[PDB]
């Protein structure tokens, strides 16, 4: 019946915060946008300012071309009919070129040539954004933890669309650009490679994805439980350990027999999450290139009755 600190009771708005100018080129940083009261019930209300530098323009333009290229092909598949475009929006797909072309770039635009053009734009947009993540932290003097955690997600993305198709020897092994289509690619991948459930790195990837939800539920609920002592201010709890950090530690020590610190819990956090895609990338890379039947592979390694 008491306050649960899940939504704010009183919203307070002051002058718009322009952010810290550590080493950031202020001419590239825009102005503050509108204040959203709807967002203010849950988190901050201030929107913006956003920084848009050289890598921001490169990522925005390359990704926009990738987005527009898929959309124009979707319009082509709809026959330029808006009614069909909305009706079959989840059914359209930009398929990779057929396996008969292998890794060649001599594939017609309708038969995978547009997939290569769109994939090139996506390649530039994602890597340009990664550098943007690195350079934003560098301009503020912060650590590069964000960029390296992003690199783990890029590794799975690179394996799915680039690294494994090269190792498998054809672009047809890659993921199509479609809502329901890339769900069919995911399902077909498991059936082709013999029940990907028995891929040990797929199982580990799920263990960390499950553990990410478990750990964020634990950490999110722990901070909200000690936010009555200022626990949400985690940086000042690291520098000057208050009673919020001690109660948070003692709850889990009395529960689990061991605990974390205000800073070390975020080392558990970043590793639990990056291991999802790091381990996931290895498991996908091992499928087709090393193991083609994971259930048969399972049977020869325990994991399944003979």
């Amino acid at each position: 019946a008491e306050y649960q600190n899940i939504f704010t009771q009183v919203q307070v708005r002051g002058p718009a915060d322009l952010g810290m100018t550590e080493d950031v080129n202020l001419a590239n940083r825009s102005g503050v946008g509108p204040f959203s009261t709807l967002l203010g019930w849950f988190g901050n209300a201030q929107l913006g300012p956003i920084y848009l530098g050289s890598l921001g323009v490169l990522s925005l333009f390359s990704g926009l071309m990738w987005f527009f290229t898929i959309g124009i092909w979707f319009w082509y598949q709809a026959g330029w009919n808006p009614a069909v475009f909305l009706r079959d929006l989840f059914f359209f797909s930009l398929e990779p070129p057929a396996p008969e072309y292998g890794l060649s770039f001599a594939a017609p635009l309708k038969e995978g040539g547009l997939w290569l053009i769109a994939s090139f734009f996506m390649f530039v947009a994602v890597w340009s954004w990664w550098g943007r993540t690195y350079l934003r932290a560098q301009a503020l003097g912060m650590g590069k933890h964000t960029a390296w955690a992003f690199l783990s997600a890029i590794w799975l993305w690179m394996v799915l669309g680039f690294i494994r198709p090269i190792l498998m020897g054809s672009w047809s092994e890659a993921v199509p650009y479609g809502i329901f289509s890339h769900l069919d690619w995911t399902n077909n991948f498991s059936l082709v490679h013999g029940n990907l459930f028995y891929n040990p790195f797929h199982g580990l990837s799920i263990a960390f994805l499950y553990g990410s939800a478990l750990l964020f539920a634990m950490h999110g609920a722990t901070i909200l439980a000690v936010s009555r002592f200022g626990g949400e201010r985690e940086l000042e709890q690291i520098a000057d350990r208050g009673t919020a950090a001690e109660r948070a530690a003692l709850f889990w020590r009395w529960t689990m027999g061991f605990n974390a610190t205000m800073e070390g819990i975020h080392r558990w956090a970043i590793w639990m999450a990056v291991l999802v895609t790091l381990t996931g990338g290895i498991g996908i890379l091992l499928s087709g290139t090393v193991v083609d039947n994971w259930y048969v592979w399972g049977q020869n390694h325990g994991m399944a009755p003979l």
């Binding site: 319009w75 709809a78 026959g79 330029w80 009919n81 808006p82 069909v84």
Partner: peptide, 27 residues
């Protein structure tokens, strides 16, 4: 606010005109 009018008018006019020709393009 004359600015917001132009953005709202400009988007509606452009998207419908694109849509109108696309409907013509579809047939």
């Amino acid at each position: 606010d004359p600015r917001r009018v132009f953005v709202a008018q400009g988007v509606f006019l452009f998207l419908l005109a694109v849509m109108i020709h696309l409907i013509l393009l579809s047939t």
